[PDB]
Amino acid sequence: SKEYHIDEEVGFALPNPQENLPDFYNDWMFIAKHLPDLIESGQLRERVEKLNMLSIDHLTDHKSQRLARLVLGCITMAYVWGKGHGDVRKVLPRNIAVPYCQLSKKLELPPILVYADCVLANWKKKDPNKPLTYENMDVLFSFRDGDCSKGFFLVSLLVEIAAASAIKVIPTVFKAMQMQERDTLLKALLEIASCLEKALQVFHQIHDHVNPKAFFSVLRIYLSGWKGNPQLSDGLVYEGFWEDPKEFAGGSAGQSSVFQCFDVLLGIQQTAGGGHAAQFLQDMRRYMPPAHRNFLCSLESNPSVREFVLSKGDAGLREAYDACVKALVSLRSYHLQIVTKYILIPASQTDLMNFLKTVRSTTEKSLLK
Ligand code: HEM
Ligand SMILES: O[C@H]1CCCC[C@@H]1CNc1cc(Br)cc2[nH]ncc12
């Protein structure tokens, strides 16, 4: 629906995002569009510091506002991390922080790049008459020449969109349970499983478009945040807007609404327990667009799909429920392999692994089998 801002084609992603801002913001667009060149040449922080505080009043519709969040969030990452070898900035100039925070509070997101910026809104179709394929798609922004940002962000999105195809089946699952349509429920659960099975196959493209050295040594620097970060132990002064510095976490697929919503749908209690894994995924919901955050708590309001299947003594239903759980297990298992190639191996030339393995365990132990 439109009350939750879920598109029938791309789900939680922003459909056909805006590429251009009103000419009044050209001084933003130029820095954002040339971050690689400007960083390399020691001129990024300069060009930022020479900016005039612009007003967000000319950002009239949602898409224009989302684009500027992406522009300003990428500038902020560039400004704070600089060249990504340690010369850090801990105060962000008012000429940029003030419009950023005002545009942020209006869209109900923290003033920091989030998944919904750099994946869900950081894309375009090359030719609009051709479909959503990697070859028909590009990102809007990058940080460095060679950072594989187009590969990482686009493959992330294409997996999102693949998994997104199961979202339209959630209403039928809940109506089938309510009106006791056993065979309809079963068909719906297998269609959802089928969708999470394609999402895995899409994920395979990551290897052609991302390389480990670039992800580990470049891209991950610019996706990092300032929450529990020793390089900014107290957070980031948003000059002109907040007195004391604030801590906000970096971009994460933990901020994706598709995967969190299938854990909810299936009663995989990712956000229960009180433990570190659950608390993290709960926190990451505040880094989501408000309608998407609301979608998820609305799913939790609904009768448990798991408890209904469990109580029914129906092997066919249980195999279908498990076909969905299994697909998440498979997805998460593949992801652990990818995390070995792109983080763990390069780093030899963690709390990460324990977090992912706890989420994957909770998923596997949800199987009925
Ligand atoms: C080079 C590729 C990738 C790397 C190195 C990577 C790495 C990581 C790491 C280290 C985490 C845990 C830390 C954190 O949350 O910040 C994580 C979480 C997560 N990643 Fe990735 N990721 C990659 C691509 C993807 C893709 C393509 C997807 C999904 C389509 C994905 C889905 C997730 C999800 C859903 C989580 C949250 C926990 C979970 O639900 O299992 N990642 N990723
Ligand atoms: O683990 C973190 C280490 C440093 C900060 C960024 C790294 C993970 N962030 C991600 C961002 C986006 Br966008 C998408 C993602 N999918 N999976 C992980 C991830």
Q: Which helix (H) or strand (E) covers residue 105, if one does?
A: helix 94-107
Instruction: Provide CB contacts within 8 A for 311, sequence distance 6+.
Output: none
In this structure, are 231 and 318 located in the same domain?
A: no
Ligand 1: which of 288, 335, 362 to mutate, most ligand atoms within 8 Å of CB?
335
Estimate to the nearest angstrom the gap between the alpha carbon of 85 and the chain centroid: 25
Instruction: Verify that 66 and 133 share a domain, yes or no.
Output: yes
Q: Report the C-alpha gap between 296 and 285 in whole angstroms.
A: 9
CA 315 – CA 350 distance, rounded (Å): 39
| Alpha carbons 283 and 363: distance in angstroms, whole number | 19
Q: How far is the CA of 179 from the centre of ligand 1 (A)?
A: 37
Contacts of 276 (CB under 8 A, 6+ apart): 355, 358
Measured CA distances, 151 to 43, 209, 292 (Å):
26, 5, 25
Using CA atoms, how far apart are residues 104 and 76, in angstroms rounded to an integer?
13
Q: What is the resolution of this structure in A?
A: 2.5
Name the token pair of 74: 């990428």
CA 133 to chain centre: 19
Q: Which two tokens stand for residue 331?
A: 């997805």
Measured in angstroms, how far is the CA atom of residue 132 from the centroid of ligand 2? Answer: 23
> Would you call 91 helix, strand, or coil by DSSP?
strand
Do the strands 124-125 and 137-138 form a parallel or antiparallel pair, or are they unpaired? antiparallel
Ligand 2: residue whose CA is nearest its atom 9: 252
CA atoms within 13 A on the CB side of 358: 18
Are residues 32 and 181 part of one domain?
Answer: no
Question: Is 260 in the same domain as 341?
Answer: yes
| Tokens representing residue 164 in the block | 């997104």
Q: Which of 237, 153, 164 is nearest to 195 (CA)?
A: 164
Secondary structure class of 238 (helix, strand, coil): strand
What is the distance between the alpha carbons of residues 195 and 232, in angstroms, rounded to a whole number?
A: 41
Q: Are residues 169 and 200 in the same domain?
A: yes
Distance 223 CA to ligand 2 centre (A): 7
Residues 6+ apart with CB under 8 A from 250: 112, 113, 223, 224, 225, 226, 227
As given in the structure block, the two tokens for residue 220 are 């991950």
Q: Where a domain ends, among 213, 248, 283?
A: 248
User: Three-state SS for 137?
Assistant: strand
Tokens of 285: 């919901």
Return the structure tokens found at 31.
Answer: 């820095």
Pocket of ligand 2 (CB under 6 A): 115, 118-119, 156, 220, 223-224, 250-253
How many other C-beta atoms lie within 10 A of the C-beta of residue 301?
A: 8
Q: Which ligand is nearest to the CA of 284?
A: 1
Ligand with minimal distance to 251 CA: 2
**Ligand minimally distant from the alpha carbon of residue 334:** 1
Q: Is residue 85 a known part of a binding site?
A: no
Same domain flag for 178 and 254: yes
Domain count, the chain: 2
The last residue of a domain, from among 248, 282, 300: 248
Residues 91 and 105 in one domain: yes
Which helix (H) or strand (E) segment holds residue 253: the answer is none
Give the angle 330-333-337 at the CA atoms, nearest 5°. Answer: 135
Q: What does the alpha-carbon distance between residue 317 and residue 190 come to, in Å, rounded to a whole number?
A: 9
**Ligand 1: centre distance to CA 154 (Å):** 14
257 shares a domain with 125:
no
- Tokens 């068909």: give the residue: 187
**8 A C-beta contact, residue 69 and residue 77:** no
| Whether residue 105 sits in one domain with residue 254 | no
Angle formed at CA 227 by CA 223 and CA 229, multiple of 5 degrees: 80
The residue segments making up the domain with residue 258 are: 1-17+146-223+249-369
Kindly give the number of the ligand 1 atom that is closest to the alpha carbon of 203: 27
**Residues followed by a break in the chain, C–N over 2.5 Å?**
349
258 CA → ligand 1 middle, Å: 13
Do 28 and 59 meet the contact criterion of CB atoms below 8 Å apart?
no
Distance between CA 48 and CA 63 in Å, rounded? Answer: 24
CA atoms in the 13 A half-sphere facing the CB of 149: 24
